[PDB]
Design a protein around this ligand. Structure first.
Ligand code: CL
Length: 90
């Protein structure tokens, strides 16, 4: 059913089109949430949507855009909270 997924992404992922990439793929799957740069150069993605869509997004996130180098994605799922009206990047 509907879940929230948290993913923290490590690698070369800031400055490289990653957040926009996430966003575009989240929109195509009807997923809401955000992606945010963190102070250590990692990117946090919070996504809410159906589990199968969240799994497809996570397969894209493990892939990343051309300039990026996604080395590790630590992710969990948890209860859907319905906090988001769109997918934003911060
Ligand atoms: Cl797609």
């Amino acid at each position: 059913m509907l879940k929230r997924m948290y993913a923290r992404v490590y690698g070369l992922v800031q400055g490289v089109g990653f957040r926009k990439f996430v966003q575009i793929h989240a929109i195509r799957l009807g997923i809401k949430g955000y992606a945010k740069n963190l102070p250590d150069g990692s990117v946090e993605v919070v996504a809410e949507g159906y589990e199968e869509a969240l799994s497809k997004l996570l397969e894209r996130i493990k892939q990343g855009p051309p300039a990026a180098e996604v080395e590790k994605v630590d992710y969990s799922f948890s209860e859907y909270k319905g906090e988001f009206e769109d997918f934003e990047t911060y």
